[PDB]
Amino acid sequence: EKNEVMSSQLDIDNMAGVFYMLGAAMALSLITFICEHLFYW
Amino acid sequence: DMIVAPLTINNERAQYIEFSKPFKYQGLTILVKKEIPRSTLDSFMQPF
């Protein structure tokens, strides 16, 4: 009887990787806003 | 002079008694209680 109770959203590593992707998106937003400010003028 | 009841059949008894033919076949088995209960517990919080 080799088994275990499955893992709910207790995964701090998985959610942390997703949140790191979110922060990368934030940085991309910053850089594209800077680039839009450059392309306007 | 006779024993009419749910009496089993096995050689231990069959040494000293005479048995008729069987009048209801059967076996042995196990009984255990049945339980319903769900597992709701801080439903918003358990995966949280």
Tell me the shortest Cα–Cα distance from A8 to chain B, in angstroms.
5
The encoded tokens of residue A28 equal 């991309």
Name the amino acid, one letter, at A16.
A
Helix %, strand %, coil % for chain A, to 5? Answer: 70, 0, 30
Q: Do residues A7 and B46 make contact, with C-beta atoms less than 8 angstroms apart?
A: no
Deposited experimental method = cryo-EM
Phi, psi for A15 (deg, rounded to 5): -60, -35
Which positions in chain B have a beta carbon within 8 angstroms of at least one beta carbon in chain A?
A: 46-48
